[PDB]
Design a protein around this nucleic acid. Structure first.
Ligand SMILES: Nc1nc2c(ncn2[C@@H]2O[C@H](COP(=O)(O)OP(=O)(O)OP(=O)(O)O)[C@@H](O)[C@H]2O)c(=O)[nH]1
Ligand SMILES: [Mg+2]
Lengths: 271, 817, 82, 81, 82
RNA sequence: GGUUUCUCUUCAGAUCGCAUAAAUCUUUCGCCUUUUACUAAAGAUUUCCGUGGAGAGGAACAACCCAAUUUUUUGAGGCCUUGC
């Protein structure tokens, strides 16, 4: 039935490495701050655009006091990213507004370069420590000479076990991977539902790109968001089957052919 | 659109030595919440949501066992970690007895940890630290175990620096050796103390002593296998400090096998560890696997418990530390003693420092820590507002108690009665309270005093006007506003003369959710909102040339008064209460004379601190031959003080608070036996006098500034600088974070220019930088507020040389006119 | 479970059936107990016996009891403050 | 090593009372106390189950066969535990 | 295998325990430790040839236990899994 | 009593299927010569590709450190006489 795969870590790491050209290098969720779906929803509803995100039909379409200019202090002028970040504050008459604003702590991840280099070493890209401060202070330190001594045997929890293994670094890196690579087992999926390039168009602010393609990125986001907005559950369900009905009836027979051969047969039949 | 043990719960509640109140805190995203989540998972295998940022604090009461199997009752306040919401943390801190601060291992100590340590120490609470997210030193930073030890020690050192900064006595310094420190990872349900980790060694192995081991693990102690005894280093060879040898190395090995292998060798490692897993469990995805395995290895969640039980005093100790600061009487003859014993008895007492809402209805249940005695359902109770004093019967309402509840996280346990030391929700005492309130024996003789109302770490600065779309809906909106005043602690509202309804907040995020609450829940009415603007304060930069002296409305009294600036430190000290008014002239003068070279005579001449009991302004009388008509002077002096207070509360320029100014009297003319004439006429006159001195010689505006901490990669530091340049900011300090590939930027930025700052920063860096900002510092606005030669273009932003004029005029146009 | 009751006044029952009441100050692996201001009772543990509450009471003082001969313990009264 | 045991060793050189498993009561100076509660004493007064007394110069009682010991109150003042 | 582990799982159950000295104990288990030392609450304890006494708390040295009578409801097959 | 894949019946989508189609109706826009075919946002509804849960049936693959003399795995159990 070819559902539910379960692999070893080694398999996963090998597959990951094979896949690298198609894969996003963002380990945190911070890249996508106002480039996520929540922001797009907000943006839609307020009829705003975030500089390189999607535009939209406006959701729908008299003099006032606060508005008056003379009473307004302007140091910095209220940009649309603020309106989306804090849409119940900087924005009158919000409707259908979602709340962006979460802290996805910054992901600090060191790509390893070379096989040597044990999976746990201080990479040059860290920042050296150098604990420096006041005097240490004092603590009821129970000077020896008193008495006492271990009855012997007990030892640190894992002693024969080494700290690290040839797979250790790879195993750790499997922890910070995009979705299909972080798991040993899973359920099999149809090939159609595997959109290899989704994370390419979700990229945040490219620049150096000919106008034409930047528009295409904007349009792909528009499709993305609309699908997410539109996503009713099935809402009602029937398990009716077609090929099982056809196959149970004597007018159909079954076999196995070369795909190519079937294709040819279908074209002839259609003609 | 818990039956069996609650009895058990009640038993625990009764005892008062099995219960403790503790607080989790630390910098944004260091894993406080996942720790609690994972704890709850073990315990019960049975706007915030959408944002992912904690905003409102949550009270959780739970029954937890220590390493010896003794159960306790814990009252845990889970506060928010965003710096804009520190208001709720102060609420928590008033209620509780100690505090747990956990700093994410990979981040280090950050802005809000520093502020919270300061604050909790000043609140006389007991301080412990859980370092969370130790997994990030292994799985993410991939440090060597040796280096992770260094990093951990650095954290400890930094916190000790901070703590020593604000505590007169080093009674407490934190070292896992003393039992003040967790090393944990809530995500993977690993949580231990140096001691409780030793328990693991003993219980798997033989008789070896639990405590003698533990005390010798942390801190440049090495272990010679030949000796069989731990030693100050004598092995030149290079053997990892014993924390590494016995803890971090095997912790790494456990994690490494599970992430790294999990198929090839993981099972045997588990046999060595003594962990049996089933086939199902071993087929799991790696992060859940890690959590599983560590749950088996590392126990229930002991360390938090032991730390709290040993170092937090408990309520029984409770009141005496608590009674001192909180209670206006401060104890002496009756009630202070009563509070201190804490036995349910006598008057009963309560302190309300929160109002947790109910979504469905207008009414909300109040929350507080029962100080003495006990509350029962339906008992009539007497409310004390913060305003009410000893003989102010008017403000003290009474009502009954609908239901009592004990709060698990977002569950409401009904109960019949609640004893002293415990936290409780009270239904029915809602309508008559606003923010802080105390609950007392109702219409029963005794007498009462109210606990000091909440002091906050921050100052509210950002001002928003609010107005409903249809004027006929106004009262609904007003009702809504009342509700949010109860809901949020520092959220301050006011209606200013134009009819403009104003909300003062701490910053953008805060205010956004205040608006959210208001529009979405408390009133369905469509609401207009004005652009964010800050408050300003008013000051003087030089001694007045000449002094205007106002005859009273009755032409009977004259007051000659000048004004000049205070040396910065004075005002800052005045407010902190270090120099505060209560001490006898002898003491006060000694302080000022000693610290600022104040004149003895001038010291003697000090009357009052103006607007607030602790306020920036000072009032002083110096006219020696004429002064020595003190009796007459005395008669009027208090009315002058009241005029002063009122005049500095209210503003000659922008109708704002006057800051950092000394007012000094040179000539007292008072009618012989001033009568009602003097009594009534002088106050209005005095306000005039104050203004006249101020304006004549020599006003300026004060803009509030924020302190900004930015976390960011090396590549984007320049971008941060650029942003601050755009907003008139200026940077203080730019330095890499020890042990982690990021830089920290500290900077300042004017409040007005702070609007949208965060978001522009983050946008220009592609969400790599992140900025926190908190009010920190007031500072004079560059221009001259009073200069009619300056022509203001109506919409175009002005240059700095005359911002003062722009701000002044527009603010006056907004209301003062 | 033992450390909780430490410092409290405790009613301890011996294997012969004696009643030792003292201040529970220390224990160990074997349940050897340290009992301060300890008295021994034989005839009764009073629940307000109208005739008398106390017969064959003996003042002992500072007592170390061996755990071998201990059966059980209940809380008798709170810790003396001293 | 147990906390009560340390307190027992502290009573060495003091006058102590010992009851055995058989209820004989021995009062005198504790010379030596071993880890297992083995007790060497001197200049004893023994009070039997019938009430009668006797006098002994030197005794040694096995730890297991001790029901309990009474120690001076001089010791009461190990409050850490 | 080690059946004390099984007993350690019975916190918050109510049981009747018969002692070696004949005493009968009915109460709610707060804790069993590795030595089978058992701690209870809301305890009605009947020494052989007395009327019951009620104790809020009672702590039994493990060795003095003869046997536990368990709740009829108890799902043993669950508890015997490790 | 355990493990694995076939079949049937029953039930369930409040953030999911870390994916994203088509259709109906009711509105404003945009093509505009008429109708289809269409523009692009909202709302109310369905159909389809997958999916979970429960039961029953059939098949295949295995299979009927810490109790040894000083404490915590008992030397305890039982009987009778005397005393207000
Ligand atoms: N690498 C790693 N990440 C963690 C760990 N624990 C938590 N995190 C992540 O760090 C973030 C912190 O989790 P939270 O518990 O929500 O943080 P917080 O303490 O609630 O911070 P507040 O917003 O102030 O409440 C989450 O997004 C987690 O996914 C950990 O042990 N290791
Ligand atoms: Mg949180």
């Amino acid at each position: 039935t070819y559902q539910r795969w379960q692999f070893t870590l080694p398999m996963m790491s090998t597959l990951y490495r094979l896949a690298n050209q198609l894969l996003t290098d963002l380990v945190d969720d911070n890249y996508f701050y106002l480039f996520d779906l929540k922001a797009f929803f907000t943006s839609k509803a307020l009829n705003m655009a975030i500089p390189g995100g999607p535009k939209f039909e406006p959701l729908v379409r008299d003099w006032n006091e606060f508005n008056d200019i003379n009473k307004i202090i302007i140091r910095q002028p209220i940009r649309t990213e603020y309106k989306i970040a804090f849409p119940y504050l900087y924005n009158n008459l919000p409707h259908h507004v979602h709340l962006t604003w979460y802290h996805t702590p910054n992901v600090v991840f060191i790509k390893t370069e070379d096989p040597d280099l044990p999976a746990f070493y201080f990479d040059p890209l860290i920042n050296p420590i150098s604990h420096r401060h006041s005097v240490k202070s004092q603590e009821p330190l129970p000077d020896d000479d008193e008495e006492f001594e271990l009855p012997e045997f007990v030892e640190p929890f894992l002693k024969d076990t080494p700290l690290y293994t040839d797979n250790t670094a790879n195993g750790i890196a499997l922890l910070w991977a995009p979705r299909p690579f972080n798991l040993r087992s899973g359920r099999t999926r149809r090939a159609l539902d595997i959109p290899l390039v989704k994370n390419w168009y979700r990229e945040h602010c490219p620049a150096g790109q000919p106008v034409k393609v930047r528009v295409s990125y904007q349009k792909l986001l528009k499709y993305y968001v609309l699908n997410a907005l539109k996503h009713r559950p099935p809402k009602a369900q029937k398990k009716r089957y077609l090929f099982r009905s056809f196959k149970a009836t004597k007018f159909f027979q079954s076999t196995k052919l070369d795909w190519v051969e079937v294709g040819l047969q279908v074209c002839r039949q259609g003609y | 659109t818990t039956v069996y043990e609650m009895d058990f719960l009640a038993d625990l509640m009764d005892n008062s030595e099995l219960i403790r109140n503790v607080t989790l805190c630390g910098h944004l995203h260091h894993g406080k919440t996942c720790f609690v989540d994972c704890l709850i998972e073990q315990t019960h295998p049975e706007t915030e949501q959408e944002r992912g940022v904690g905003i409102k604090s949550t009270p959780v009461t739970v029954v937890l066992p220590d390493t010896k199997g003794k159960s306790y009752l814990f009252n845990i306040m889970d506060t928010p970690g965003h710096v804009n919401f520190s208001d709720e943390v102060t609420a928590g801190l008033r209620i509780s007895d100690g505090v747990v601060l956990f700093i994410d291992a990979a981040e280090g100590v950050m802005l809000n940890t520093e502020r919270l340590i300061k604050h909790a120490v000043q609140e006389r609470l007991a301080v412990t630290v859980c370092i969370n997210k130790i997994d990030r030193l292994i799985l993410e930073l991939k440090l060597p175990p040796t280096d992770a030890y260094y990093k951990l020690r650095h954290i400890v050192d930094e916190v000790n620096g901070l703590i020593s900064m604000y505590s007169t006595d080093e009674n407490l310094i934190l070292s896992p050796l003393l039992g003040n420190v967790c090393f944990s990872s809530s995500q993977y349900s690993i949580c231990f103390t140096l001691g409780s980790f030793a328990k693991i060694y003993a219980d798997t192995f033989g008789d070896i002593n639990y405590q003698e081991f533990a005390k010798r693990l942390w801190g440049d102690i090495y272990f010679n296998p030949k000796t069989r005894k731990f030693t100050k280093k004598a092995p030149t060879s290079s053997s990892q400090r014993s924390f590494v040898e016995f803890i971090l190395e095997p912790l790494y090995k456990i994690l490494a096998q599970v992430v790294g292998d999990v198929d090839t060798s993981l099972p045997r490692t588990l046999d060595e560890l003594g962990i049996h897993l089933t086939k199902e469990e071993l087929k799991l995805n790696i992060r859940p696997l890690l959590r599983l395995v560590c749950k088996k290895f590392f126990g229930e969640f002991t360390g938090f418990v032991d730390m709290c039980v040993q170092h937090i005093p408990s309520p029984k100790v409770g009141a005496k530390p608590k009674i001192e600061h909180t209670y206006t009487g401060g104890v002496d003859s009756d009630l202070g003693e009563a509070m201190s014993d804490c036995d349910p008895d006598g008057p009963l007492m309560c302190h309300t420092t929160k109002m947790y809402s109910t979504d469905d209805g207008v009414q909300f249940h109040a929350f507080g820590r029962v100080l003495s005695g006990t509350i029962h359902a339906g008992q009539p109770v007497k409310v004390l507002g913060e305003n009410y004093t000893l003989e102010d019967e008017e403000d003290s309402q009474i009502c009954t108690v609908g239901r009592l509840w004990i709060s698990v996280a977002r569950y409401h346990i009904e109960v019949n009665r609640v004893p002293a030391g415990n936290w409780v929700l009270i239904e029915g005492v809602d309508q008559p309270i606003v923010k802080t309130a105390t609950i007392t024996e109702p219409r029963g003789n005794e007498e009462a005093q109210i606990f000091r109302p909440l002091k906050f770490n921050t100052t509210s600065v950002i001002k928003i006007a609010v107005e409903p779309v249809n004027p006929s809906e106004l009262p609904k909106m007003l009702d809504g506003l009342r509700k949010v005043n109860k809901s949020y602690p520092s959220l301050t509202t006011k209606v200013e003369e134009s009819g403009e309804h104003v909300i003062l907040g701490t910053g953008e995020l805060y205010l956004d959710c205040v608006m959210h609450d208001l529009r979405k829940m408390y009133s369905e009415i469509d609401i207009k909102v004005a652009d964010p603007v800050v408050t300003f304060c008013e000051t003087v930069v030089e001694t007045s040339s000449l002094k205007c002296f106002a005859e009273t409305p009755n032409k009977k009294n004259k007051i000659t008064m000048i004004a000049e600036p205070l040396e910065k430190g004075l005002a800052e000290d005045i407010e902190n209460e270090v120099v505060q008014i209560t001490w006898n002239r002898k003491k006060l003068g000694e302080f000022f004379q000693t610290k600022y070279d104040w004149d003895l005579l001038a010291a003697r001449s000090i009357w009052a601190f103006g607007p607030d009991a602790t306020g920036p302004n000072i009032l002083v009388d110096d006219t020696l031959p004429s002064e020595v008509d003190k009796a007459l002077l005395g008669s009027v002096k208090d009315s002058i003080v009241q005029g002063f207070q009122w005049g500095t509360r209210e503003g000659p320029l922008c109708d704002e608070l006057i800051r950092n100014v000394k007012f000094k009297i040179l000539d007292a003319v008072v009618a012989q036996e001033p009568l009602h004439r003097g009594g009534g006429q002088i106050i209005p006159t005095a306000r005039r006098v104050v203004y006249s001195a101020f304006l004549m010689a020599t006003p300026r505006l004060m803009e509030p500034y924020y302190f900004v901490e930015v976390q960011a990669p090396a590549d984007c530091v320049s971008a941060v600088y650029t942003v601050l340049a755009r907003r008139r900011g200026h940077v203080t300090q730019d330095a890499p974070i020890p042990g982690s590939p990021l830089y920290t930027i500290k900077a300042f930025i004017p409040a007005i220019d702070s609007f949208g700052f965060e978001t522009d920063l983050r946008t220009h860096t592609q969400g790599q930088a992140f900025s926190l900002s908190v009010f920190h510092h007031w500072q004079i606005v560059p221009g001259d507020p009073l200069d009619k030669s300056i022509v203001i273009r109506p919409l175009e932003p002005q240059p700095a040389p005359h911002l003062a004029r722009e701000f002044m005029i527009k603010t006056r146009r907004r209301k003062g006119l | 479970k033992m450390l909780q009751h430490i410092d409290y006044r405790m009613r301890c029952i011996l294997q012969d059936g004696r009643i030792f009441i003292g201040t529970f100050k220390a224990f160990d692996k074997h349940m050897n107990l340290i009992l301060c201001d300890c008295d021994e009772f034989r005839k009764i543990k009073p629940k307000n016996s109208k005739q008398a509450e106390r017969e064959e009471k003996r003042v002992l003082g500072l007592v170390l009891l061996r755990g071998e001969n201990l059966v059980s313990m209940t809380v008798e009264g709170p810790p003396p403050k001293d | 090593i147990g906390v009560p045991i340390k307190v027992l060793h502290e009573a060495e050189g003091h006058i102590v009372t010992c009851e055995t498993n058989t209820g004989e009561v021995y009062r005198g100076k504790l010379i030596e106390a071993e880890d297992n509660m083995n007790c060497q004493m001197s200049n004893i007064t023994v009070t039997y189950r019938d009430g009668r007394v006797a006098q002994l110069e030197q005794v040694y009682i096995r730890g297991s066969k001790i029901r309990f010991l009474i120690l001076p109150d001089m010791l009461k003042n190990m409050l850490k535990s | 295998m080690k059946l004390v582990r099984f007993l350690m799982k019975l916190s918050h159950e109510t049981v009747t325990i018969e002692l070696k000295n004949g005493t009968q104990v009915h109460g709610t288990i707060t804790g069993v430790d590795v030595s089978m030392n058992t701690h209870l609450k809301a305890v009605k304890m009947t020494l052989k040839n007395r009327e019951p006494v009620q104790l809020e708390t009672l702590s039994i040295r493990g060795n003095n236990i003869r046997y536990f009578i368990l709740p009829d409801s108890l799902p043993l097959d669950t508890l015997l899994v490790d």
